[PDB]
A paper describes a structure:
Substrate-binding proteins (SBPs) are key structural elements of the ABC transporter system that determine the substrate specificity and high affinity of the ABC uptake system. A typical SBP consists of two α/β domains, which are connected by a hinge region. To understand their molecular functions, we performed a crystallographic study of single domain SBP from Rhodothermus marinus (RmSBP). The overall structure of RmSBP showed the single α/β fold, which is identical with that previous reported, although the molecular flexibility was distinct.
The crystal of RmSBP soaked with NaBr (RmSBP-Br) belongs to the orthorhombic P212121 space group with unit cell parameters a = 92.84, b = 97.86, and c = 101.98 Å, containing one RmSBP molecule per asymmetric unit. The crystal structure of RmSBP-Br showed the three disordered regions at the α2-helix (Arg58–Gln64), the loop between β5-and β6-strands (Asp151–Gly154), and the C-terminus (Gln176–Leu182). These three disordered regions were shown to have relative flexibility in the previous crystal structure analysis, but were clearly disordered in RmSBP-Br. Although NaBr was used for soaking, no electron density map corresponding to a Br ion was observed, and it is possible that NaBr had diffused in the solvent regions in crystal packing, increasing the flexibility of the three disordered regions. This indicates that these regions of RmSBP are likely to be dynamic in a tentatively solution state. However, the position of three disordered regions of RmSBP was not directly related to the previously predicted substrate-binding site of RmSBP. Therefore, these regions may be involved in interactions with potential partner molecules or receptor proteins. The sequences of the disordered α2-helix (Arg58–Gln64), loop between the β5-and β6-strands (Asp151–Gly154), and C-terminus (Gln176–Leu182) in RmSBP-Br are similar to those of RpSBP and potentially have a similar molecular flexibility.
Author numbering: 27 to 57, 65 to 150, 155 to 175
Amino acid sequence: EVTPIQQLFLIKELKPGIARIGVIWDKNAANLQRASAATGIKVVVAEVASLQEVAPQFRTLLRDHQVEALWVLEESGLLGQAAARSFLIKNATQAGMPVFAPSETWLKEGACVTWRKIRLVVNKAVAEAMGITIPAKY
């Protein structure tokens, strides 16, 4: 597993000058401040407990917090549902925001970047449209 601080530092390298990122978090999953402080990227967490909360909570990340990307950390329950994943990817993409995701299943559906212990995995077509260049050293 790639830890959250390792993930956020990788996001910082892919999106230099990102200032605010939104996390959609499954309230019922098992188990960011040091990550946020170590990177200087504000992390806004919107928690969801069921599918019907995903749309309202996502739209609050955008309306109230002006986030520049979506970050999903795990998929053990609600965020493992196809409907939640498809909603988040489609609406983040419509809003012009890349999605940093926990597995490659997300990338096949249009998320931008995931990771594995650390190697990066990139949906090249999405990263290019989003203006994301993978560092040469990676």
